[PDB]
Amino acid sequence: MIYMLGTNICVYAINKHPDSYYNNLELLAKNNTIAISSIVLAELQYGVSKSKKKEQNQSKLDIFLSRLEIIDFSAKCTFYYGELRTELEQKGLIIGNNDLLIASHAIAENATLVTNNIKEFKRIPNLILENWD
Amino acid sequence: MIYMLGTNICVYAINKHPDSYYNNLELLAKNNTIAISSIVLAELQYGVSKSKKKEQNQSKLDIFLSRLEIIDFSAKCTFYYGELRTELEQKGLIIGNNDLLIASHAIAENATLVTNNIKEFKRIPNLILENWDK
Amino acid sequence: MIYMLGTNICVYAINKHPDSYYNNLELLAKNNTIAISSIVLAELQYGVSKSKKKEQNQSKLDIFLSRLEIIDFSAKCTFYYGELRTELEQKGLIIGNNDLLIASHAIAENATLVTNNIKFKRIPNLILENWD
Amino acid sequence: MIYMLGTNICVYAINKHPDSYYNNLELLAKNNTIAISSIVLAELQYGVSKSKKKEQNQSKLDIFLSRLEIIDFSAKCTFYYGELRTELEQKGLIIGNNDLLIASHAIAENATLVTNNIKFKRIPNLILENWD
Amino acid sequence: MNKAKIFMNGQSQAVRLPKEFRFSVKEVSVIPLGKGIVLQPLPNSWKDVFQEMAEIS
Amino acid sequence: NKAKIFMNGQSQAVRLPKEFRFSVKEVSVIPLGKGIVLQPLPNSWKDVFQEMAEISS
Amino acid sequence: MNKAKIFMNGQSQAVRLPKEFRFSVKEVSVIPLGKGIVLQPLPNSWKDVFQEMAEISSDDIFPEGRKDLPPQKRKYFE
Amino acid sequence: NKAKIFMNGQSQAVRLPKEFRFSVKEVSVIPLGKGIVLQPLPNSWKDVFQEMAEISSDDIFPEGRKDLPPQKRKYFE
DNA sequence: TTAATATATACTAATTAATATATACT
DNA sequence: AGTATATATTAATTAGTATATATTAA
């Protein structure tokens, strides 16, 4: 199984580095693939560029990525994004621009999206989720 | 070089099919690579799914993509996105959503980004632009 | 991940074709790789050659292998075999000669070995899954 | 042509390093391929792991392997193994598990099996060469 | 801009797929769309194998 | 309906059912979700724009 | 019987690995064994990843949180 | 200690620490579990046998090989 | 009895690996 | 001393082109 981490899981891992997070990651890494979308990486890079301690935050992000596979947002994801965006709009469900791309990438890869806070993420059709806290 | 088309160029090409667009494409295709970001394709696929005539719109999009290269949004684009988004917010400027991802992608590929208007990609640093008037 | 089927799982699948095994294989194949060691295939081919219904049993094994990956017993496996055999003998525990090769192949590939008798459980560093 | 070395030839080469063995190897190596099955390597790795001087024995094995080709026991070998095992059992002919796999591998590769102890002598379709 | 050649396999027509568009499955569904067709992977059927294994007996 | 995947040389291929046969020697391959669209390949950007105009009008 | 060439990379010596011996890790363990060496895959553990991040001092990423604005309803095609 | 893996052309390479530098321009590569052994390559079978003779160790298989007959199983019907 | 199924091969194109250097930086 | 990346050329491998043919289920 491919486990795709949501931006919020990554931000909390870099900022707060909780022991429960590394234990969950080490357990899954033994028989599964831990990855992040290049969309999540775009968000993480924005977090670093926006900060005061850019060099240190980049260093922490680089260390965090040493153990992850960065999956490119590919042509295969686009049909799923199209279908998902339409369906969410039809049901009156509002999702942020990046979260919508991240969700559709998880769907295209048939991956489990690891989220810090579920909220409207469960309302997303054909999406496998796992919540950590 | 690489010419990446923006969403507006692509939507106008499919809907209005102007002669000036195919003449620019045929001219450029002879010595350059015509491409679209997978981010543009995400927007075009949303256009299809949302529409009433899904089959026809998919067909037209499939025909449009036949002489294009679809470039995946890769890890190399991420650094440029982070820097561009931060700079635009610092200046109080907004070229939100996918257009920021699309612009980052052209910057990362060292490509000319093809536009329809001045609003789509405004005062965006380090970005090579080319406007095809409607 | 990689799921490596043991000899007994394969023999029971071909002979008895249980729904439970089918269910398992249709479920795991969606996100994982179903595979066998070339050691298992050596044993299954012997089962066919020994058999009264040779032609039919070959046909059934051929169909069974169509959705399977046959992994060669490679040079990387040898170090694990040597270490595993020595350790098992040191603890006085006795495993079948082919089963010892099949187990050391699952360890070398970091695969889940699917068995018919877990209580195989004594083998160190081996991931197992039992099917009924 | 392919010359595949049996376990006994290998064990004697590493332990006793006889003058005659390297002369036969050097002669054949000029126009032929000298190789071992990954089944032989599994046995030699077990020999290393079992020993008291593990580091030295691994070093000797590593040096021995430097000029030979390690051939993986593949899917093509399986049909030959099944046929050979059935035939040997039918005739009441005893053969060790590993020797049966090593013999089938040579048969599959159409190789000459280099042996130390003659009686491999009764295996059908197997090309042999004995060294003293 | 990827292209694929059409060739004959027996009395059937066939399309040679470029490496980038290779399938990991055995069968695909075929549905018309405009002047062409869409090909979608069909699940690697363990059902199909268990049916013929039972048929042989 | 369905189509089988087979090997032709070192390339993968799809055997087309008779009803889905093409009258051209080469096709355009476009991704769509986990699969692909096979369609006639327009020779140029003018043909592409002409072909799109035929679908709409 | 496999061979690999020794070459220079900067002021360091390097061994060009044949394709069959490629590693999927970016770091390896090097241990002596007789006249040679053993190379084994050495990936950083998630524990080591978290320990290395904890050593680095910086301000938090997204202190006010993530601003992921929703897209606008677009009617691209008819 | 540790060595970094990098790209040289389209080939993968290992950067050796100074203490592990070789005085030859080509090495022998042998698999060992998930990894490899890099060692000097003897020029011939004589040099292979001479290098093994220099190493002092206990004999492998002193009691001999325990190659028991293949294990039995129920197979088809 | 006509598609389709299954496999096989000689060859050439295209792609990817490997060789052998170069460079500026930490 | 090591990190990191670059790249031209040739060597080698792998993909693709073209074809052939004997069987079998629709």
PDB file of C-alpha atoms in Angstrom, chain A residues 1 3 6 35 40 47 50 62 79 88-89 99 103 115:
ATOM      1  CA  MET A   1       0.000   0.000   0.000  1.00  0.00           C
ATOM      2  CA  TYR A   3       0.394   6.093   2.093  1.00  0.00           C
ATOM      3  CA  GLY A   6      -1.569  15.443   3.711  1.00  0.00           C
ATOM      4  CA  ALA A  35       4.975   9.350  -0.176  1.00  0.00           C
ATOM      5  CA  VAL A  40       2.081  18.969  -0.761  1.00  0.00           C
ATOM      6  CA  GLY A  47       5.836  27.464   4.304  1.00  0.00           C
ATOM      7  CA  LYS A  50       7.372  32.570   4.015  1.00  0.00           C
ATOM      8  CA  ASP A  62      15.193  18.316   3.378  1.00  0.00           C
ATOM      9  CA  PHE A  79      -9.558  12.951 -15.042  1.00  0.00           C
ATOM     10  CA  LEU A  88     -18.070  18.458  -4.704  1.00  0.00           C
ATOM     11  CA  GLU A  89     -19.573  21.613  -6.318  1.00  0.00           C
ATOM     12  CA  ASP A  99      -6.537  19.979  -0.948  1.00  0.00           C
ATOM     13  CA  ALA A 103      -7.185  14.355  -2.703  1.00  0.00           C
ATOM     14  CA  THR A 115      -4.744  13.575   7.461  1.00  0.00           C
TER      15      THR A 115
END
